[PDB]
Design a protein around this nucleic acid. Structure first.
Lengths: 48, 53, 47
DNA sequence: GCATCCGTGAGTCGAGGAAGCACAATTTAACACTTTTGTCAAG
DNA sequence: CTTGACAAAAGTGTTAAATTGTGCTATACTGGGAGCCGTCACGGATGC
């Protein structure tokens, strides 16, 4: 059944129990933004 | 250049091929105004210290 | 200050390249429409 | 003509940061003193 | 606006440490040491 409407899905669905893992790649560790910051010595370009 | 140009009329293709290569280098110095002896360094430039910090 | 960004200038990377080409004994010179030299170092390197 | 050699090229972000001493010569530090400078109250 | 005490605030001048540069050793000594090694493309140049 559809939880929003209460009407059934028009076709039978494959429902079961599956083992799923939470991997080490998390958006918390990867989101990064910068306006201004440190610059390099010789080229004076932003660090990476 | 005058000697090289004269050798540019040699019947052999290798002789003219070699003469053209020599004269292309000779022409480059003649046109640009550089001196061949400038390819040997008497004074070595030193890079500014901030580019080699 | 609430203003529009100004026009850019010569990057510092190109100035580093010119000094590195000079460190190789190569005379790299930026010219103008009339072939006259144009100083991109603000006179800071002209003796 | 042909092999054989050398030289240049081979994807992009990201994350991972063992002499030793002597001595002379030069420099640095610590006094000393005088010479500004900054305040003061006046006046 | 000055006008004279004042006091650090600073500078100039020696002096002595502390640091730094330099020369010198007298048995005889006489030509180095580390790679070693699985890729494939091309030009382009020479050995002729």
């Amino acid at each position: 059944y559809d939880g929003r409407t209460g009407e059934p899905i028009e076709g039978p669905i494959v429902v079961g129990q599956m083992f799923i893992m939470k991997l080490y790649h998390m958006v918390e560790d990867k989101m990064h933004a910068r306006s201004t910051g440190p610059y390099s010595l010789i080229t004076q370009q932003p660090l990476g | 250049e005058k000697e090289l140009l004269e050798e540019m009329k040699h019947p052999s293709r290798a002789r003219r091929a070699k003469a053209r290569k020599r004269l292309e280098v000779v022409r480059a110095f003649l046109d640009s105004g550089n001196r061949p002896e400038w390819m040997i360094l008497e004074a070595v430039p030193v890079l500014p210290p901030d580019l080699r910090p | 200050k609430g203003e529009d960004v100004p026009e850019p200038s010569v990057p510092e990377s190109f100035r580093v390249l010119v000094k590195e080409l000079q460190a190789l004994a190569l005379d790299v010179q930026t010219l103008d429409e009339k072939d006259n030299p144009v100083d991109i170092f603000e006179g800071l390197a002209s003796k």
